[PDB]
From a paper:
This enhanced MAb, 18.5C-M30, introduces two Arg residues into the heavy chain via the insertion of one Arg into CDR H2 at position 54 and an Arg substitution into CDR H3 residue 100 (L100R). Here, we determined the structure of 18.5C-M30 in complex with LI-pfGP. This structure shows that the two engineered Arg residues form salt bridges to Asp400 and Asp407 of LI-pfGP. Binding kinetics show that 18.5C-M30 has an increased affinity for the LI GP monomer compared to parental 18.5C, primarily due to a slower off-rate. Our LI-18.5C-M30 structure pinpoints the following three LI mutations at or near the GPC-B site that decrease antibody efficacy and, thus, are responsible for the immune evasion by LI: a deletion of position Y62 and substitutions at positions 198 and 397.
Three GP monomers associate on the viral surface to form a trimer that drives viral attachment and cell entry. Lineage I is particularly resistant to neutralization by GPC-A and GPC-B antibodies: many antibodies neutralize other lineages but fail to neutralize authentic LI LASV.
Residue numbers in the entry:
A (entry chain C), G (entry chain B): 65 to 168, 182 to 195, 208 to 244
B (entry chain G): 2 to 136, 144 to 223
C (entry chain F): 2 to 154, 163 to 214
D (entry chain c), E (entry chain a), F (entry chain b): 259 to 326, 332 to 414
Write the structure that this text describes.
């Protein structure tokens, strides 16, 4: 005869499953492990201008963090279709991680955004570049509490 | 959740006894029950088992098969352990515990109970006798002999001196009566200064004997 | 099943890690193995249920491992209230509840010299019925001690928190008419700290 | 496929079945435990959005202890959850309809008995939650069921 | 996976549940309204052909109304329907057994009550529709359920 | 998805439904036939294993007769079984927990009536089988609904 | 109310589905049809020294038994994170069958064996080679009764 509400904390499921949260439509957060963190930032500018990258040696050079490559691999695979030209590029020199996508096609990447940190048409955003970067702990989860369904559904 | 119960005590050889384990605070029928004893000095021993809300499968220890019966009543939520033809090896402390036995859950007794003393003896309680043990640092003692298994309190100088006093727990005997010795150690200075009196108070028969041990 | 613990008694001080071993004979299913704690007055507790698991209200100093016929219970750090009896338990086989024999963990210290005393009977004990003589040792360590009685050449308390050092008594008993045979009686006690045996005797009168 | 996992239960419970939820994965609350009768309904319904979270909690609880990467959940994701719920809520949100984000839940407590019912979840739309009145009938509908629980 | 879609309900319906077919949805017929009691069995079954068709009809209504290519069903097909029924019917057809084809159905109408039954589908076998007596017992088997519906 | 196959019944059956295992699919046993009521519980629960074996037996029985390679099961692996049972048992095995090896089962028979329960498979652990006592409560919990089966 | 047991015989499901059984920790028997047989073994010795082997002509020759190669096809396809770089010691000359690999990556293939006939870390078996062989209708299936669900799990 009495109504009650409970809100679940999704922070305990830390390492068993990656998590994700939202500050603003510019950048999305991914956390894996105890501390490992990735930013998915929308920006009109380009921070790297190298013209050649490839994925075979990225897993072949074998000195990387192998628990991290998986999320960007599933991001690369889950996009519906892809242009023959490799507009997207990557760079992992020095151990760092940098994956850039030249938005300026966008339909698939925008639905991937709608799912990773979660009418139907090809409306595009005014931003022109996606940057995929390493980050520190800092704080990206304050407006909305983090959840694991941003990654479970796209597996 | 906890189990409350009572029972046990002194019974003459050849009698009959009943152990009751009452239950409160959980769904009784959905659990299995165990009866386990602990004899003085050794490890725990199985006594009996019973399964869940069927009363069907019953198991007893290899040593004590036959003289025991175990049953469970859901109406009053009580474990009943009926003991017949008591022997001289049943003196121990009993626990009644509960555990479930399925696929997902491993086996463990979690909600235990209260220990229950059970003792068999031929004679009744008979008041002990107090013996003196007067001798850099020396020691003096009070001994009590011809003593019943029930607990007693023995004290020096009405409890004034509570430092360096050792009371020895009762040990297995031959005749069938316990006994115990207490010793207190003091330096050479304290000898002949403070009056020392051995006091024994024993609840069955309420024997309260106070003997002033002096030369 | 024959199920035994090892070693019989462990002596260690807080700060380091310690291990206890449980061994069986028949093949062992790891999913039905429990580890139990038994202190003085309180009812026994459930330290671990499962081969390597965790209880609801147990500190993180405990861990378990092993397989086949070997079980290792490891405590990485100690506590002032972690010295009592331990047990390893298996469900099934024969009988259904295979409790272990026993285990005990104590504190380590250097050797100590016992204080010895001998108490002979008195003249009033003709009313006692049977003569008794008490050979008493106090404040000795370690547990290894042997007591014997000689003609013409048992009781123990618990380890105490304040001192952690043991006591021992021997109550030699002789029938009244049987005592008037000899006049000199000795009790001897030996322990590893004192290689040379020390024997003490008394003369009737 | 179909989810197949089972609930582990706990030592020291009122009843054999029934999942008790601790205080380390809640917000502004202590540990909270549900009745076995409510738990009995997860293994018979496919549209429930709550028992998936209990299954994820139990999987993590039993993966932290009896182990020592992330491929485990890659292999176990289908056996744990139902991706059709995710797709259903995605298609419902893309049509601008209130949808459940698996964040907070409402249940019908009973003051004395404590026979809490299986919670559905609060919905959301464009970042704003709802109000108690907007799903009034829902709040009443489950109430009817509890009356039939008396039978 | 499992089908997860729900029912959109109607405006003038006597009962909150239930789905009413339109005249422009059938052939040489009128609009028909099924009771909520009958349609309450779709969410608790997996071997029926009618309820999948109702799910597709609901999805079509919502898609044409609340939006303005074909990838929508390319992504929602698992949610709406169950491919295992397609596999089962195809296997029954390749081994030459009478099988369903999602075209025409049969049900029972109680004239006075108005309560109906879930329409199990008709059977075809190599270009020949079945004749009524062949599955006679089925036509009466569900009839027994009406007796149990008196309770 | 969801399994969709159905029981084909027999000729000399005493009841309209219910499978009957023959002599050739058992070890050191004769032919045994279960009641129709017990088999009626296969098409309504996803947490059982014996009915998967019956589905495979039936599929093979029709395959040998009605047809004269192996793509028949590659195309129909899902329609018969549920892969999540395999995944769940594999996860139980990898966590050093009792699991089911799909080989032998235990059921509960009645001396006079012959009404039988749905068998659940016997559990193993590291090449060693269990004793009856280790899951005693299971053996009796089903017994309880036997009384409930009288209602 | 009495208890009974029954034991199914998987030998009848003979030609509809592949069957698998175990002899010891390093031996696996695969059977399809009635007489054909495959041996899956772990062994410390190498056999084939031919470093060149392509899979196109394997299906292109068409002289092979087309009801058998599918199983080893699913076997090398189901293994995860396979580099497709080298060490593929396949050989089918004369119509025969032979597949072997180095184990010194092995985590995936060992998990594959554990699934194909039946903690979790990168277990390193001491054996160095995996042998695929044709065989005769012997009595391999004696240590454990063969079951078909080993193949169902992989599929
Ligand atoms: C990463 O996950 C761990 C595991 O849950 C979190 O640590 C827990 O934190 C809660 C809240 O303080 C404690 O009650 C638990 O005891 C902790 N568990 C362990 C194993 O330490 C941790 O907080 C998570 N990381 C972050 C940044 O939130
Ligand atoms: C291959 O499968 C067939 C089909 O079950 C087996 O033949 C059956 O064997 C049993 C056992 O004696 C007989 O009762 C059946 O009548 C046989 N069915 C037939 C011949 O159609 C055969 O034994 C299996 N062979 C192997 C090597 O496993
Ligand atoms: C399992 O048993 C088989 C057969 O009993 C063993 O196969 C042996 O293989 C070696 C070559 O590697 C041969 O020289 C032997 O003649 C085979 N038979 C034997 C040893 O009986 C196989 O080695 C066994 N598995 C293990 C791990 O030892
Ligand atoms: C989002 O917030 C970050 C805060 O660091 C800011 O840098 C960025 O410009 C913001 N973007 C938008 C679109 O508000
Ligand atoms: C990939 O890119 C690297 C970087 O220059 C280059 O050395 C390599 O040849 C490219 N191809 C492969 C197959 O690695
Ligand atoms: C992210 O991690 C890589 C790993 O070495 C490191 O090289 C890079 O500098 C990190 N990015 C930061 C700290 O912003
Ligand atoms: C990104 O795309 C834009 C398209 O407007 C192009 O002008 C620009 O050169 C591209 N950046 C590259 C190729 O680095
Ligand atoms: C990027 O460019 C678009 C149009 O060129 C503009 O609308 C948008 O505000 C720009 N974003 C930023 C962050 O300046
Ligand atoms: C299984 O049993 C064997 C005894 O045959 C034992 O050596 C082994 O440790 C047990 N456990 C595992 C995981 O093999
Ligand atoms: C099962 O019971 C038998 C008694 O016949 C016993 O020998 C065995 O150890 C028990 N446990 C098993 C087989 O795991
Ligand atoms: C339901 O409410 C009662 C008091 O009204 C409380 O004791 C109980 O904990 C509540 N149930 C839950 C699951 O919190
Ligand atoms: C059932 O019959 C009644 C009256 O005979 C009619 O109004 C109703 O439309 C029928 N049901 C359907 C589904 O047509
Ligand atoms: C139905 O009846 C007609 C004539 O009465 C007959 O030709 C037809 O074959 C029957 N239906 C079937 C499926 O045989
Ligand atoms: C159950 O018992 C009856 C009578 O003993 C027997 O006819 C029947 O075959 C048994 N059930 C099975 C499955 O064998
Ligand atoms: C196995 O079968 C192939 C295919 O005909 C054949 O070439 C090979 O010689 C066979 N191996 C043995 C050992 O019989
Ligand atoms: C393993 O690698 C060595 C080179 O180190 C090579 O000679 C051998 O043929 C390889 N074996 C297999 C089975 O691939
Ligand atoms: C294979 O070689 C390894 C490494 O030398 C060794 O440990 C193992 O026992 C060998 N296996 C044999 C000889 O069967």
């Amino acid at each position: 005869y009495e109504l009650q509400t409970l809100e679940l904390n999704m922070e305990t499921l830390n390492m068993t499953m990656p998590l994700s949260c939202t500050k603003n439509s510019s950048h999305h957060y991914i956390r894996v492990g105890n501390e490992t963190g990735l930013e998915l930032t929308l920006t009109n500018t380009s921070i790297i201008n190298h013209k050649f990258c490839n994925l075979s040696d990225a897993h072949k050079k074998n000195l990387y963090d192998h628990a991290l490559m998986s999320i960007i691999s599933t991001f690369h695979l889950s996009i519906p279709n892809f242009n023959q030209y490799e507009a997207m590029s990557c760079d992992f020199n020095g151990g760092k991680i940098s994956v850039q996508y030249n938005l300026s096609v966008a339909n698939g990447v925008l639905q991937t955004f709608m799912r990773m940190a979660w009418n139907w048409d090809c409306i595009m955003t005014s931003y022109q570049y996606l940057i995929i970067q390493n980050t520190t702990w800092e704080d990206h989860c304050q407006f909305s509490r983090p959840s694991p369904i941003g990654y479970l559904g796209l597996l | 959740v906890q189990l409350v119960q009572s029972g046990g005590g002194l019974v003459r050889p050849g009698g009959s006894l009943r152990l009751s384990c009452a239950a409160a605070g959980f769904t009784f029928k959905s659990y299995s029950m165990n009866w386990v004893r602990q004899a003085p000095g050794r490890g725990l021993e199985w006594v009996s088992s019973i399964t869940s809300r069927g009363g069907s499968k019953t198991y007893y220890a290899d040593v004590v098969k036959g003289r025991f019966t175990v049953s469970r009543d859901n109406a009053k939520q009580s474990l009943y352990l009926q003991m017949n033809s008591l022997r001289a090896e049943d003196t121990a402390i009993y626990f009644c515990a509960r555990s479930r036995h399925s696929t997902s859950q491993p086996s463990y007794m979690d909600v235990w109970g209260r220990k229950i003393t059970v003792i068999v003896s031929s004679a009744s309680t008979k008041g002990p006798s107090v013996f003196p043990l007067a001798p850099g640092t020396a020691a003096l003692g009070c001994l009590v002999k011809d003593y019943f298994p029930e607990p007693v309190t023995v004290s020096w100088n009405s409890g004034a001196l509570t430092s360096g006093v050792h009371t020895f727990p009762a040990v297995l005997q031959s005749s069938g009566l316990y006994s115990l010795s207490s010793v207190v150690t003091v330096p050479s200075s304290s000898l002949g200064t403070q009056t020392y009196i051995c006091n024994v108070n024993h609840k069955p028969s309420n024997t309260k004997v106070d003997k002033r041990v002096e030369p | 099943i024959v199920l035994t613990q090892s070693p019989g008694t462990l002596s260690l001080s807080p700060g380091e890690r310690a291990t206890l071993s449980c061994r069986a004979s028949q093949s062992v299913i790891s999913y039905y193995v429990a580890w139990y704690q038994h202190k003085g007055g309180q009812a026994p507790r459930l330290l671990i249920y499962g081969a390597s698991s965790r209880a609801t209200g147990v500190p993180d100093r405990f861990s378990g491992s092993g397989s086949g016929t070997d079980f290792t219970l490891t405590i990485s750090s100690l506590e002032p209230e972690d010295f009592a009896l331990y047990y390893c338990q298996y469900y099934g086989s024969s009988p259904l509840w295979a409790f272990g024999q026993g285990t005990k963990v104590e504190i380590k210290r250097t050797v100590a010299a016992p204080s010895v005393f001998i108490f002979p009977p008195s003249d009033e004990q003709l009313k006692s019925g049977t003569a008794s003589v008490v050979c008493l040792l106090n404040n000795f360590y370690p547990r290894e001690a042997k007591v014997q009685w000689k003609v013409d050449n048992e009781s123990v308390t618990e380890q105490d928190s304040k001192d952690s050092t043991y006591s021992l008594s021997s109550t030699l008993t002789l029938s009244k008419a049987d005592y008037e045979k000899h006049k000199v009686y000795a009790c001897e006690v030996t322990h590893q700290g004192l290689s040379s045996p020390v024997t003490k005797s008394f003369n009737r009168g | 496929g179909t989810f197949t996992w089972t609930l582990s239960d706990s030592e020291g419970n009122e009843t054999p079945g029934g999942y008790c939820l601790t205080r380390w994965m809640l917000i502004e609350a202590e540990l909270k435990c549900f009745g076995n009768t409510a738990v009995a309904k997860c293994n018979e319904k496919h549209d429930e959005e709550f028992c998936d979270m209990l299954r994820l909690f139990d999987f993590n609880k039993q993966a932290i202890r009896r182990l020592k990467s992330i491929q485990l959940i890659n292999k176990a994701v289908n056996a744990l959850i139902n991706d059709q719920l995710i797709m259903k809520n995605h298609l419902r949100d893309i049509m601008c309809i209130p949808y459940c984000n698996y964040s907070k839940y409402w249940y019908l407590n009973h003051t004395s008995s404590g026979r809490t019912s299986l919670p559905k979840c609060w919905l959301i739309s464009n970042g704003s939650y709802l109000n108690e009145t907007q799903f009034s009938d829902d709040i009443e509908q489950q109430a009817d069921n509890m009356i039939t629980e008396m039978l």
